[PDB]
Design a protein around this motif. Sequence first.
Motif, PDB file in Angstrom:
ATOM      1  N   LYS A 132      52.177  14.138  37.411  1.00  0.00           N
ATOM      2  CA  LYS A 132      52.742  13.277  36.191  1.00  0.00           C
ATOM      3  C   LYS A 132      54.338  13.124  36.303  1.00  0.00           C
ATOM      4  O   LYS A 132      55.013  14.026  36.483  1.00  0.00           O
ATOM      5  CB  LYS A 132      52.475  14.183  34.716  1.00  0.00           C
ATOM      6  CG  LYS A 132      51.142  13.851  34.514  1.00  0.00           C
ATOM      7  CD  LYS A 132      50.910  14.483  33.343  1.00  0.00           C
ATOM      8  CE  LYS A 132      49.411  14.079  32.390  1.00  0.00           C
ATOM      9  NZ  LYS A 132      48.344  14.286  33.344  1.00  0.00           N
ATOM     10  N   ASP A 173      50.034   9.767  37.557  1.00  0.00           N
ATOM     11  CA  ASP A 173      49.097   9.506  36.580  1.00  0.00           C
ATOM     12  C   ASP A 173      49.765   8.666  35.786  1.00  0.00           C
ATOM     13  O   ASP A 173      51.045   8.483  35.763  1.00  0.00           O
ATOM     14  CB  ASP A 173      49.089  10.992  35.864  1.00  0.00           C
ATOM     15  CG  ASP A 173      47.908  11.642  36.410  1.00  0.00           C
ATOM     16  OD1 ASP A 173      46.789  11.184  37.152  1.00  0.00           O
ATOM     17  OD2 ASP A 173      47.756  13.045  35.751  1.00  0.00           O
ATOM     18  N   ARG A 234      43.498   3.696  40.348  1.00  0.00           N
ATOM     19  CA  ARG A 234      42.877   4.151  39.588  1.00  0.00           C
ATOM     20  C   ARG A 234      42.573   3.317  38.333  1.00  0.00           C
ATOM     21  O   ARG A 234      43.608   3.165  37.468  1.00  0.00           O
ATOM     22  CB  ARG A 234      42.931   5.583  39.138  1.00  0.00           C
ATOM     23  CG  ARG A 234      42.103   6.176  38.203  1.00  0.00           C
ATOM     24  CD  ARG A 234      42.786   7.593  37.513  1.00  0.00           C
ATOM     25  NE  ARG A 234      42.899   8.698  38.408  1.00  0.00           N
ATOM     26  CZ  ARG A 234      43.713   9.708  38.290  1.00  0.00           C
ATOM     27  NH1 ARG A 234      44.265   9.711  36.960  1.00  0.00           N
ATOM     28  NH2 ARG A 234      43.920  10.421  39.232  1.00  0.00           N
ATOM     29  N   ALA A 239      44.322   7.200  27.785  1.00  0.00           N
ATOM     30  CA  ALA A 239      44.198   8.593  27.045  1.00  0.00           C
ATOM     31  C   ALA A 239      45.291   8.738  25.769  1.00  0.00           C
ATOM     32  O   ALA A 239      44.958   9.579  25.232  1.00  0.00           O
ATOM     33  CB  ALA A 239      44.671   9.715  28.050  1.00  0.00           C
ATOM     34  N   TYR A 240      46.094   7.721  25.604  1.00  0.00           N
ATOM     35  CA  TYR A 240      46.958   7.932  24.859  1.00  0.00           C
ATOM     36  C   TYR A 240      46.957   6.910  23.524  1.00  0.00           C
ATOM     37  O   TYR A 240      48.159   6.682  22.878  1.00  0.00           O
ATOM     38  CB  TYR A 240      48.606   7.877  25.368  1.00  0.00           C
ATOM     39  CG  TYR A 240      48.694   8.810  26.549  1.00  0.00           C
ATOM     40  CD1 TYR A 240      48.326   8.569  27.733  1.00  0.00           C
ATOM     41  CD2 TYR A 240      49.456   9.869  26.328  1.00  0.00           C
ATOM     42  CE1 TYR A 240      48.422   9.600  28.829  1.00  0.00           C
ATOM     43  CE2 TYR A 240      49.517  10.921  27.378  1.00  0.00           C
ATOM     44  CZ  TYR A 240      49.152  10.388  28.627  1.00  0.00           C
ATOM     45  OH  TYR A 240      49.334  11.450  29.610  1.00  0.00           O
ATOM     46  N   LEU A 316      36.338  13.210  34.600  1.00  0.00           N
ATOM     47  CA  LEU A 316      37.170  14.205  34.364  1.00  0.00           C
ATOM     48  C   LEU A 316      36.088  15.497  34.397  1.00  0.00           C
ATOM     49  O   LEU A 316      35.077  15.536  33.991  1.00  0.00           O
ATOM     50  CB  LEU A 316      38.019  14.517  32.885  1.00  0.00           C
ATOM     51  CG  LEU A 316      38.963  13.262  32.605  1.00  0.00           C
ATOM     52  CD1 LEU A 316      39.216  13.260  31.235  1.00  0.00           C
ATOM     53  CD2 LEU A 316      40.102  13.170  33.790  1.00  0.00           C
ATOM     54  N   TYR A 340      38.695  14.710  38.606  1.00  0.00           N
ATOM     55  CA  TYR A 340      39.821  15.015  38.324  1.00  0.00           C
ATOM     56  C   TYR A 340      39.916  16.501  37.677  1.00  0.00           C
ATOM     57  O   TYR A 340      39.135  16.901  36.759  1.00  0.00           O
ATOM     58  CB  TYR A 340      40.635  13.979  37.262  1.00  0.00           C
ATOM     59  CG  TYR A 340      41.819  14.312  36.886  1.00  0.00           C
ATOM     60  CD1 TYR A 340      42.298  15.202  36.019  1.00  0.00           C
ATOM     61  CD2 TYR A 340      42.962  13.459  37.386  1.00  0.00           C
ATOM     62  CE1 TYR A 340      43.714  15.477  35.638  1.00  0.00           C
ATOM     63  CE2 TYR A 340      44.218  13.497  37.164  1.00  0.00           C
ATOM     64  CZ  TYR A 340      44.767  14.649  36.075  1.00  0.00           C
ATOM     65  OH  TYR A 340      46.197  14.840  35.763  1.00  0.00           O
ATOM     66  N   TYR A 352      46.758  18.502  27.248  1.00  0.00           N
ATOM     67  CA  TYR A 352      45.767  17.628  27.879  1.00  0.00           C
ATOM     68  C   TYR A 352      44.419  17.996  27.049  1.00  0.00           C
ATOM     69  O   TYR A 352      43.823  17.210  26.693  1.00  0.00           O
ATOM     70  CB  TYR A 352      45.466  18.252  29.135  1.00  0.00           C
ATOM     71  CG  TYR A 352      44.243  18.122  30.086  1.00  0.00           C
ATOM     72  CD1 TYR A 352      44.337  16.854  30.809  1.00  0.00           C
ATOM     73  CD2 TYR A 352      43.008  18.355  29.997  1.00  0.00           C
ATOM     74  CE1 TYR A 352      43.433  16.406  31.726  1.00  0.00           C
ATOM     75  CE2 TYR A 352      41.993  17.849  30.680  1.00  0.00           C
ATOM     76  CZ  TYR A 352      42.100  16.846  31.296  1.00  0.00           C
ATOM     77  OH  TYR A 352      41.053  16.427  32.366  1.00  0.00           O
ATOM     78  N   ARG A 355      44.366  15.539  23.969  1.00  0.00           N
ATOM     79  CA  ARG A 355      43.787  14.403  24.556  1.00  0.00           C
ATOM     80  C   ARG A 355      42.367  14.259  24.581  1.00  0.00           C
ATOM     81  O   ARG A 355      41.553  13.436  24.353  1.00  0.00           O
ATOM     82  CB  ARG A 355      44.707  13.796  25.781  1.00  0.00           C
ATOM     83  CG  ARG A 355      46.007  13.315  25.286  1.00  0.00           C
ATOM     84  CD  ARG A 355      46.711  12.781  26.532  1.00  0.00           C
ATOM     85  NE  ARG A 355      46.947  13.416  27.682  1.00  0.00           N
ATOM     86  CZ  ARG A 355      47.636  14.344  28.084  1.00  0.00           C
ATOM     87  NH1 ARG A 355      48.728  14.520  26.982  1.00  0.00           N
ATOM     88  NH2 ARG A 355      47.775  15.039  29.246  1.00  0.00           N
ATOM     89  N   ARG A 356      41.778  15.434  25.192  1.00  0.00           N
ATOM     90  CA  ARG A 356      40.377  15.397  25.467  1.00  0.00           C
ATOM     91  C   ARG A 356      39.463  15.722  24.323  1.00  0.00           C
ATOM     92  O   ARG A 356      38.599  14.933  23.847  1.00  0.00           O
ATOM     93  CB  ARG A 356      39.881  16.773  26.191  1.00  0.00           C
ATOM     94  CG  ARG A 356      40.539  16.850  27.795  1.00  0.00           C
ATOM     95  CD  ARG A 356      39.967  15.742  28.543  1.00  0.00           C
ATOM     96  NE  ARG A 356      40.452  14.374  28.133  1.00  0.00           N
ATOM     97  CZ  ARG A 356      41.489  13.903  28.399  1.00  0.00           C
ATOM     98  NH1 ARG A 356      42.635  14.764  28.974  1.00  0.00           N
ATOM     99  NH2 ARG A 356      41.750  12.785  28.414  1.00  0.00           N
TER     100      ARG A 356
HETATM  101  O1  TFB Z   1      46.393  13.614  31.117  1.00  0.00           O
HETATM  102  C1  TFB Z   1      45.543  12.936  30.709  1.00  0.00           C
HETATM  103  O2  TFB Z   1      45.096  13.295  29.520  1.00  0.00           O
HETATM  104  C2  TFB Z   1      44.857  11.785  31.415  1.00  0.00           C
HETATM  105  C3  TFB Z   1      43.446  12.193  32.157  1.00  0.00           C
HETATM  106  C4  TFB Z   1      43.506  12.700  33.473  1.00  0.00           C
HETATM  107  C5  TFB Z   1      45.122  12.240  33.864  1.00  0.00           C
HETATM  108  O3  TFB Z   1      45.732  11.574  32.556  1.00  0.00           O
END
Ligand code: TFB
Lengths: 393, 384
Positions: A132, A173, A234, A239-240, A316, A340, A352, A355-356
């Motif tokens: 990143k 990314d 990719r 994700a945002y 993921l 990933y 992260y 975001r998940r």
């Molecule tokens: O970081 C994240 O949420 C996304 C998924 C994997 C890379 O960028």
Amino acid sequence: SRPQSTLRRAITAAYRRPETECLPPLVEAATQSKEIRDAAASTARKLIEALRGKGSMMGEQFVTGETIREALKRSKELEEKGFSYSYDMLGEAATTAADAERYYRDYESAIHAIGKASAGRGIYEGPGISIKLSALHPRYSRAQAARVMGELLPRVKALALLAKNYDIGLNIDAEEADRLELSLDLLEVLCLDGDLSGWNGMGFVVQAYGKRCPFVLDFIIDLARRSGRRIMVRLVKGAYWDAEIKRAQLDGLADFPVFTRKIHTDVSYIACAAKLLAATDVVFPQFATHNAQTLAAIYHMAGKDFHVGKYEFQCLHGMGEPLYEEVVGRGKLDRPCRIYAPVGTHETLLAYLVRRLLENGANSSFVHRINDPKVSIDELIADPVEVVRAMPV
Amino acid sequence: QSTLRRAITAAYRRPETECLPPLVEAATQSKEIRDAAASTARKLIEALRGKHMMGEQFVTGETIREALKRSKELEEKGFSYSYDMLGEAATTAADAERYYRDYESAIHAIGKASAGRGIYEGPGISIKLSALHPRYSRAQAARVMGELLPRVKALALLAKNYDIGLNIDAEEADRLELSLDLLEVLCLDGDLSGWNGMGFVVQAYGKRCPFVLDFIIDLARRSGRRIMVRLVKGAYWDAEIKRAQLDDFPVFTRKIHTDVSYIACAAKLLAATDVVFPQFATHNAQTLAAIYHMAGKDFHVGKYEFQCLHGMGEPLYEEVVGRGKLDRPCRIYAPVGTHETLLAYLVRRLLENGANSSFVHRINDPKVSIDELIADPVEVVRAM
Ligand SMILES: O=C(O)[C@@H]1CCCO1
Ligand SMILES: Cc1cc2nc3c(=O)[nH]c(=O)nc-3n(C[C@H](O)[C@H](O)[C@H](O)COP(=O)(O)OP(=O)(O)OC[C@H]3O[C@@H](n4cnc5c(N)ncnc54)[C@H](O)[C@@H]3O)c2cc1C
Ligand SMILES: Cc1cc2nc3c(=O)[nH]c(=O)nc-3n(C[C@H](O)[C@H](O)[C@H](O)COP(=O)(O)OP(=O)(O)OC[C@H]3O[C@@H](n4cnc5c(N)ncnc54)[C@H](O)[C@@H]3O)c2cc1C
Ligand SMILES: O=C(O)[C@@H]1CCCO1
């Protein structure tokens, strides 16, 4: 005129084209024959039936390991099955110089460890790394592009040189919308740098929920042709989405840089896959999705001829293995999938992990709908392109 | 303005190094109390360690009728409830009106379920001001407060009709003053006389906390309303840190400083139980044990209560409520709604449960010893 003037003007022009004006060309690119549509619906049903035939909030299931060594050791099981990996040392949006330097040293040490473990397997069959840009500059979103590029490019180039040394993938990314142009300019500088010649591991993410996506892809595909690099691309949805909607509102924007209907992202993704599948000579498409319907659509759109290195799927860690266990392997769909794989402590995981949660908890997300008692398998295999195409205009 | 309001505004971004010494002095407890609190904390933590992304754990029910039915079991054990119709940060007038209708409907159902049990033994409701105004965080106070006040007053009047509690949740730091001005207008409004159900949250991670509490205690004393004060640490720390960096902080930056602020503010509230109703909202057994022994041996229903979030606090407070435990009541904050309206609340629960500094994370962490968990934050801050 300016280099790539037509391609760059198209990107800026799309940045806030009305969503209704972005849709029609995407629907034309994404339309398929009835044979393919029927084949796709049939494959997606099989995949969903297998999935429903067989996640914790605390996210232990989302990290492959606390260190790169542990992460590499735990990857042997799924590699034996035909999966590959892309390791991400957790960390983003550095706030101090001390932090940006630690993240850089983390990426550097990880490339050495991944490269040794790859043992010459190359960029398609062997592991790679994802980075990143926001981790490598202490004020990535705030500082002027000249100052950011000037301190970032040496660091990214050094990392790309190490990845070239070991012949592994290095993926940049995609993060927030406002940093797309800087990251694209960085990609172009690296792809034209002679010191990286002969290495095709440079990779770039494009987010299909963005209005710029097909034009960014146009630029990247053209960059691959003029630079001689086979760029790894990719394709993701993104994700945002919640953060972009909120940032666009507080900045007083009349039009968002992202789609606001989830089905439009779906059609954008398929339209962009079509563009990528027609260019596999100069890009290596990586179709990152956990949506069985999206996957089935790409699988049948790509045609019957396949070889490793043509394209791949991605997922993921902690989300995609159940679906892709129905995909990888001669006895399934016989297509590869790259996992990933986050690496780091619980503390580095939380951003992260948020975001998940926004992904797994949203009513509109495939991974939520598959567990939803009120969503039918009929609705899950629904073709988003044909749904849009059927609405009279 | 007033001298009490001035102290709040003076404290907004006061250097953290200047906020701490007075809190440490106010949080200091006698050795006798600290030894008893240490012993109660160890008992609670030992029991807790003997025990153990759809977000189902955190929602009481999809509807208020559903949530009310599932509450009778814990209510007879000694728990009460504060129901929260999920909804926040309304972006349009249609959302704001719908959230208002949700709160209105909940009050009718909760008040009928309460059936005269009153504000301390019966259930209550929690609301978020950001659900009730379309641009709450983005508009000015004169526009926000003047259109918000008629809506909140109407809900307070319904809560008064049923004699249930109505709590204003605390949200972002830049909205404290607005919500504080609303609280004062309501507490001085004659149409609400005789009802002690108005409640207000104060976040101890904020540098303004003790000065907000002074203002509220004085407001209760001069208005004659026994304001219910929920003392919390706070749910928005990561967002406050990020906003201030993008834009000194209005919050502390070391977790232990928030812990010291909480105990100092709990001492302030325990000395004022005549005029306010303190509600000590925490899942931290050391924090709970400290408050329990600070409060002394005299207790009656309505003096104070503890509080916890549904799906997080039951294992701890099953060791607190009831005559065979510590015989103190605990009010469960009970979200009600669909999985869609749940997401924003769930993110805050993730940051709470997953942070390494959080008690509920550390209680499950085999790397963390019991000795570390019963550690007295005030004593740790003094040494360093
Ligand atoms: O970081 C994240 O949420 C996304 C998924 C994997 C890379 O960028
Ligand atoms: C291996 C891998 C790598 C990834 N890398 C990145 C990356 O570098 N940068 C990045 O931003 N994303 C990245 N993603 C994507 C992101 O993390 C999510 O996994 C992905 O967007 C989920 O989409 P889907 O096809 O699995 O599922 P779906 O459930 O089919 O689609 C969900 C997506 O729809 C979109 N969406 C939801 N609601 C709306 C709406 N109302 N309007 C418009 N769009 C909407 C969002 O993008 C959401 O994530 C990556 C994903 C994978 C698997
Ligand atoms: C019933 C109930 C109602 C609540 N209502 C509200 C509300 O209306 N508004 C609101 O904002 N909060 C509210 N909270 C609090 C918030 O939701 C968390 O539950 C609470 O902050 C957790 O504190 P603790 O005593 O359980 O745990 P602990 O583990 O003891 O404390 C954790 C807290 O420390 C603070 N913290 C963490 N790291 C740092 C740091 N580096 N520097 C400074 N401080 C730090 C945070 O506030 C964090 O939540 C409520 C809590 C409960 C139980
Ligand atoms: O909404 C939140 O996260 C906090 C906890 C309960 C009320 O306000």
